[PDB]
Design a protein around this ligand. Structure first.
Ligand SMILES: Nc1ncnc2c1ncn2[C@@H]1O[C@H](COP(=O)(O)OP(=O)(O)OP(=O)(O)O)[C@@H](O)[C@H]1O
Ligand SMILES: [Mg+2]
Lengths: 1004, 75
């Protein structure tokens, strides 16, 4: 009965159809308040723009008839008697239900009935400005339900052309246009149809139902039923209804039902007309105080896009916010950043984030909204942008609604995901296209084609390298030059030319050029602060020092700046490149040289050679005179750190890092030249400001190296200078943000108390899409749009698992196990583009393109390091359980052989690591503990079936459980392993026999 | 099943942990047994994702604890 009552009242009152049941309950409650909520007034604004309390009060008059109060009083008097007349509770309840349908205010005086709400809404609508009068394009008939069938890309532009017919009329909203999705409920479509057909309106608006093909069958059926029913009753005989569908899905219910109505002249408009139409409607008048004033032509909406990453989108938004703070003369201009991370756009998150701003204070104040559509987003973007930018609205069925205010500026930061129409949807919008340095030089001022930012060009970062390089190329004297802070020389073009020439990359982004400049700036600063460049203090012994420093540091930058990656195009190696490092120690008196040696040649010059191969890495780095001079200063040239004592290595390391004490925290970590170079690299990146993203297999040594470095810097103090987060597919963005904020607090505390920096480490970050949030932390230096606190001593590290694919034989084994996979590789949705994830060795998602240039290989684990780690683990076992040396040797050799065999067996095992050996040692330990009792039972059991070393026996069963069971070609494994077992145990047959006898003993 | 949600696996692990709470883990153990795991493999709900943390420590966001580390067999 209530549903019938609501339908009848919705036919009697037009504007109720603007809202749903819960929205109507909200309004009924709020409007009686003084003042109503800003949310309610926004919801009403879709009927009467800028609805205020005065508007609601004026609308309330007349709707509150005295006849209604008479009815209320009558029912309040009658109900006691009516209820006394009936005795059963159910009859009393039925009476109450009827009287509540007759007069609700008698029961709930603090709420409006549907009739009074309808009248109030109609009064609000009538107080508004001029009605909307729209005209349909040619080929579309009034009074007829029109149908358009087109390609997906055409769906949205076509609907827009429908409204273009009247370019002077305002843009539509949810009242006129509904974008269908599989989740679209019947209530939305019903309210749209009611708004189109039902009477009570003041103008000839147009109504569009787009992407109807996506509607579910049930919703489409109910919509058709409602449409026909409405057309049977007293309805608008001049209605203008349009359905738009995707030709591919034409076979579905709604396009089929209206096939007769199909129109063959699909409406379209040229891109220039759509651009002019949208720009005109977005243009803000001069008198209205708005953020748009900073934008090109007072446009209240704008897109910032690029073809690749690191080109100045976020920088452009920042500069725009600054310019707005300066020009608008307002005390503060709120900036809100929203990051879209989920692959499928969640409009509810955006609405939740925007709702705080509904407050009245913002309704007439410049505000900038920044929406970042990260690379993670793949679907739902065009619909979202259509709804928010064009339809000016966002909504959830819960009832709260967002309306796009022209006094606010909306800027969208997105990377051009161009993949088919003649133009991409984004082009219709006012757009700024950011270009990389080479395009900036070649193509070149304009406000939509930004070049080199002048604040950066005047910064120390660019100016010191720029001036040094400018003198270097002309071979001018650098011995006397000295960069004066704040000085500025040359032009942006020459700076870009010199950087791009020396950068090493061909077509670099702005982030890569920034990292190069930052590195060369830091090291030139250290050079200028050293004693070799101090007031003379040397006479003239060091002629050409700065020339050499510039040349070598230009070469050194190659490792930190240049990429290390070239659907699975993502890999390169660490050992394939030399790592010649030079450091200026904080004492300003000494230097550290690692990763290369200096050799004098016949040409009177000195060349750079690899400490390992002796091959020439780079020639003519300096002249022999400088080499002799630096030797006279006792500079440690041609040092071989591999032969030095442990404490000397630790001292050189602490000196280079700036640590005062060489307190060894772990005597087991081997301080080879490679590990020391890796540490020095992570240090340099922390120092200059380059993010640290590493790629390496599990067990390659990342965690141990980071822990060793943290301990070495900690100096034994009792502090938590390092936080390790183990990322997984379930790690959401909120978890990352909370961890980052906790780490920032801990870092501030550590810096205040102990003056110690803090490290945050993300392991297996790529395993989740939330990796894009980690990008924000590393590159953007923000957290959920909020900026990080500089000088907190917090450094962030991220480790990425490699992108590898199973072999075809192993994939066959996987697809053939059991009854096979429940889903075929073709139908899978769990895929990295063309590749299903199950075929990958690591469940990893795609890297944000901004991080790709930063990733560098941590290096593979060499056989020697594997054997040494195995030896350490076996020795720990020996100490724990009192093994001898023979058992230690056998266990080490057999674990090494097992790892080797599994690595060779690419058809059965794709993943090998050291954790397996720990697992196998654990099994061995367990077998040893019980070995006393189990063997007794075995002797009993075997006596039914009418000598053993517990160590070799436990080893046999551990090998059996860990390796033998997973394998199919068990015989080859047993053949290989047998060689290492002492006699008479050097037989595959005896291994199989003992495993079988144990399995039997367990079944007994 | 293809309709199994992450919460089912989480609640199962939590229940095993409640069983292990207060007992000597050198004489008692609780095991989680998953039947027909392959059915959940590529479901849109992706429940198996929870396995990595729950296998390692026994908690997704809770802090580690000895009783939370339960045994596991998937058939
Ligand atoms: N003229 C310039 N244009 C762009 N960036 C510059 C310029 N000069 C210096 N930079 C540096 O380049 C970096 C560009 O970062 P930006 O915020 O533009 O990345 P982005 O465009 O958001 O890329 P993504 O969205 O993929 O992260 C800034 O950190 C800035 O310091
Ligand atoms: Mg950005």
């Amino acid at each position: 009965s209530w549903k019938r009552f609501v339908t009848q009242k919705r036919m009697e009152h037009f504007y109720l159809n603007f809202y749903t049941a819960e929205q109507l309950v909200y309004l009924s409650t709020e409007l009686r308040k003084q003042p109503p909520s800003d949310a309610a007034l926004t919801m009403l604004s879709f009927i009467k723009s800028n609805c205020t309390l005065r508007d609601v009060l004026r609308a309330s008059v007349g709707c509150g008839s005295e006849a209604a109060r008479y009815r209320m009083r009558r029912v309040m008097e009658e109900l006691p008697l009516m209820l006394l007349s009936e005795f059963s509770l159910v009859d009393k309840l039925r009476i109450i239900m009827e009287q509540s349908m007759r007069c609700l205010p008698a029961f709930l005086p603090d709420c409006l009935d549907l009739e009074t709400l309808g009248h109030c809404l109609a009064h609000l609508a009538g107080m508004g400005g001029s009605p909307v009068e729209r005209c349909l394009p040619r080929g579309l008939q009034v009074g007829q339900p029109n149908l358009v069938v087109c390609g997906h890309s055409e769906v949205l532009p076509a609907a827009l052309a429908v409204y273009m017919q009247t370019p002077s009329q305002p843009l539509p909203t949810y009242d006129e246009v509904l974008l269908c999705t599989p989740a679209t409920t019947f209530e939305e479509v019903a309210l749209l149809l009611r708004r189109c057909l039902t009477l009570g309106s003041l103008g000839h608006k147009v109504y569009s139902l787009l992407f109807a093909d996506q509607l579910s069958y049930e919703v489409a059926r109910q919509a058709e039923e409602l449409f026909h029913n409405l057309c049977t009753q007293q309805h608008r005989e001049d209605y203008q209804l349009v359905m738009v569908c995707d030709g591919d899905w034409e076979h579905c219910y709604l396009p089929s039902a209206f096939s007769q109505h199909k129109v063959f002249v699909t409406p379209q408009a040229p891109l220039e007309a759509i651009q002019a139409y949208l720009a005109g409607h977005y243009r803000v008048p001069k008198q209205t105080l708005s953020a748009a004033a900073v934008f090109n032509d007072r446009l209240c909406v704008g897109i910032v896009a690029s073809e690749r990453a690191g080109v100045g989108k976020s920088l452009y938004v920042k500069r725009l916010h600054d310019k707005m703070k300066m020009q608008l003369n307002v005390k503060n201009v709120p900036l809100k950043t929203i990051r879209l991370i989920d692959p499928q756009v969640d409009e509810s998150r955006v609405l939740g984030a925007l709702l705080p701003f509904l407050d009245a204070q913002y309704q007439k104040v410049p505000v900038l909204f920044h929406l970042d559509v990260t690379s993670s987003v793949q679907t739902g973007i065009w619909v979202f942008l259509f709804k928010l930018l064009i339809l000016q609205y966002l909504m959830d069925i819960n009832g709260k609604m967002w309306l796009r205010n022209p006094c606010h500026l909306y800027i969208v930061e997105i990377l051009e995901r161009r993949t088919v129409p003649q133009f991409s949807f984004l082009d219709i919008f006012p757009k700024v296209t950011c270009r990389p340095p080479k395009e900036v030089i070649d193509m070149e001022r304009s406000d939509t084609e930004p070049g080199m930012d002048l604040w950066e060009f005047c910064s120390e970062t660019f100016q010191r390298p720029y001036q040094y390089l400018r003198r270097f190329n002309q071979n001018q004297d650098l011995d006397t030059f000295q960069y004066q802070e704040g000085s500025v020389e040359g032009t942006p073009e020459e700076c870009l030319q010199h950087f791009l020439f020396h950068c090493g990359v061909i077509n670099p982004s702005w982030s890569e050029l920034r990292n190069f400049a930052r590195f060369l700036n830091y090291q030139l600063r250290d050079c200028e602060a050293s004693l070799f460049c101090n007031p003379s203090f040397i006479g003239d012994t060091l002629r050409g020092f700065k020339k050499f420093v510039v040349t070598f540091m230009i070469f050194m930058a190659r490792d930190f700046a240049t990429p290390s990656l070239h659907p699975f195009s993502l890999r390169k190696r660490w050992e394939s490149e030399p790592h010649p490092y030079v450091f200026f120690n904080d004492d300003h008196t000494t230097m550290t040289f690692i990763g290369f040696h200096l050799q004098p040649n016949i040409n009177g010059s000195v060349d750079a050679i690899s400490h390992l191969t002796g091959k020439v890495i780079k020639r003519d780095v300096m002249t022999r005179d400088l080499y002799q001079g630096l030797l006279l200063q006792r500079v440690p040239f041609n040092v071989d750190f591999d032969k030095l004592p442990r404490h000397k290595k630790l001292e050189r390391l602490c000196l280079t890092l700036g640590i005062p004490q060489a307190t060894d925290p772990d005597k087991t970590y081997e301080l080879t030249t490679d590990n020391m170079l890796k540490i020095l690299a992570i240090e340099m990146r922390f120092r200059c400001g380059i993010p640290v993203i590493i790629m390496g297999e599990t067990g390659c040594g990342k965690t141990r190296l980071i822990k060793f470095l943290s301990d070495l810097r900690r100096g034994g103090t009792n502090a938590d200078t390092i936080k390790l987060v183990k990322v997984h597919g379930g790690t959401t963005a909120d978890m990352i943000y909370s961890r980052v904020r906790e780490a920032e607090n801990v870092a501030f505390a550590n810096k205040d108390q102990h003056q110690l920096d803090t490290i945050l480490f993300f392991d297996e970050a790529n395993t989740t899409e939330a990796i894009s949030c980690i990008k924000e932390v590393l590159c953007d230096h923000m957290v959920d749009g909020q900026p990080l606190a500089e000088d907190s001593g917090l450094h962030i590290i991220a480790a990425c698992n490699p992108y590898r694919k199973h072999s075809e034989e192993m994939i066959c084994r996987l697809e053939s196990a059991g009854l096979g996979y429940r889903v075929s590789m073709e139908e899978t949705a769990d895929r990295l583009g063309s590749i299903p994830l199950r075929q990958l060795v690591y469940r990893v998602h795609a890297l944000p393109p901004s991080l790709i240039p930063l990733v560098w290989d941590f290096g593979q684990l060499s056989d020697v390091a594997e054997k040494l780690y195995i030896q350490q683990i076996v020795q720990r076992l020996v100490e724990s359980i009192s093994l001898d040396e023979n058992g230690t040797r056998v266990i080490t050799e057999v674990l090494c052989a097992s790892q080797g065999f599994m690595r060779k067996t690419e058809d059965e095992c794709s993943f090998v690591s050291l954790r397996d050996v720990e697992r196998c040692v654990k099994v061995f330990r367990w077998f040893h503990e019980h070995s006393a009792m189990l063997l007794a039972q075995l002797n009993a059991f075997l006596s039914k079936s009418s000598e053993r070393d517990p160590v070799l026996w436990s080893l046999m069963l551990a090998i059996g459980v860990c390796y033998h069971a997973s394998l199919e070609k068990k015989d080859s494994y047993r053949k290989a392993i047998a060689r290492f077992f002492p006699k008479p145990y050097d037989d595959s047959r005896l291994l199989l026999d003992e495993i079988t006898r144990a399995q039997d003993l367990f079944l007994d | 099943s293809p309709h199994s949600t992450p919460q089912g696996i989480i609640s199962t692990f939590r229940q095993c942990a409640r069983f292990q709470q207060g007992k000597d883990l050198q004489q008692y153990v609780s095991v989680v047994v998953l039947d027909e795991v392959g059915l959940a493999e590529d479901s849109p709900k992706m429940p198996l994702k929870t396995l990595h943390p729950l296998l390692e420590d026994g908690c997704i966001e809770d802090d580690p604890a000895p009783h939370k580390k339960v045994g596991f067999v998937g058939i």
